[model samples]
Target: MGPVWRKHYITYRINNYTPDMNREDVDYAIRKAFQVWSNVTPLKFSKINTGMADILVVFARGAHGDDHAFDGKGGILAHAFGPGSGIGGDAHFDEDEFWTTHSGGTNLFLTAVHEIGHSLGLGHSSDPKAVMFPTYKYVDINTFRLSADDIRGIQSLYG
Candidate 1:
């Protein structure tokens, strides 16, 4: 199993924003992304404006600072470190990709949820419909629900 937080309560901070979308939608998308996991497990996520937090979300393009660098727009949409200290739980999105609130371009809601799944200590899922699945797909966010495999994966770690 992947690593998980020892406590139920977790804090996150959005270090910056992408110009591809408005500021408010970015916050809304991120808030809803965390809700997906909290709905299933005992875990709770709160956002912090300042100071260090359990999860740090940011957007950057190629060779930002980590060993893993982004490869333009089509390749990796984002990446996150597994749970721990420092860079742990931090998620970085490729700024080269156009993030959008709705469908057509890359979807922020979809990508954020997937990266957050990694930030929460989940590896790639074999279940194609699972949120933890490595492949990116577009789905209606208003009716989106975590697959049973995803629920069991988080519950197995959190519960």
Candidate 2:
């Protein structure tokens, strides 16, 4: 998609939580996820407890008001919109999936990091090694780093 956020400063708000994880865990996951991109670019992300945000994060299952509904648990773990106004920049997670901080379940940090990439106007990378790859694969969150391809792709827009 050609649509990238015009500004570097962005705000996001957690509109809801998932029972699969505690509030603090979810909050930390989102923040750390955003950090993944902010570390490599001029973009800055802030979390808001009230009012509107550049990105609105939510958790829901099957046909949750958006056109791309969650197919229970296994099908689609989550999805997001590219940069723009209104629904754009928002991320929706499938609540049916067991969100987790560790490798035992679907790692929230990994999924959120990927979704936030979309929120920042990134599309799926053809390289399977890149984080923006469409398929979900578990990796050690602590050791994760953007692939060379991913860095080039994002910097092309934000650099």
Candidate 3:
């Protein structure tokens, strides 16, 4: 809900790791997020291991770079740059939050799916059941798959 889409093709790559969580786990979550959108549309995510990507997914603490800084706590755990061709697709996770697989900490997989929605030019929805609900709640990462609204939103963009 932060920025507008430019309708340009974008790709992503993991830049670095947050010392708090497993690197592979984060990467896997991110990929799964992309899959949710790609499943319904022609959008693709090509992993470029050696360099920067249109989407610069990373974990950073307060005011790392952008004006929208992390709260250093659970409040706003993560955010993303909206759709565009280059840096506009960047996604950032607040390293301060407890990034975990279950209840105690923020579930990486579930949250990433929502953030990916933002990166793809989606805004927070009024529907509390929607993935783009702008708040964190523990959800089954596997079952956090796209809702009918989600599929419709992305499909509207690229279909």
User: What's model 1's TM-score?
Assistant: 0.98
- Estimate, for each residue in 1-159, the C-alpha lDDT of model 3 and write its tens digit: 345555445678887787767788777878887887788777777878887577888888999977897888868999987877666878899989888766777887788888888888888877778888777778776566677887777767665
- Model 1, 34-77: lDDT tens digits are 99888989998999999989999999999999999999979799
Clashing residue pairs for model 1: none
lDDT tens digits by residue: candidate 2, 1-159: 379999989999999999999999999999999998998899999899999899999999999987897899687899999999999999999999999999976999999989998998888999999999999889888898889888888898897
Give the whole-model CA lDDT for all candidates, comma-separated: 0.92, 0.92, 0.78
TM-score of each: 0.98, 0.97, 0.89
* Clashes (N, CA, C under 3 Å) per candidate: 0, 0, 1
Order of quality (TM-score): 1, 2, 3
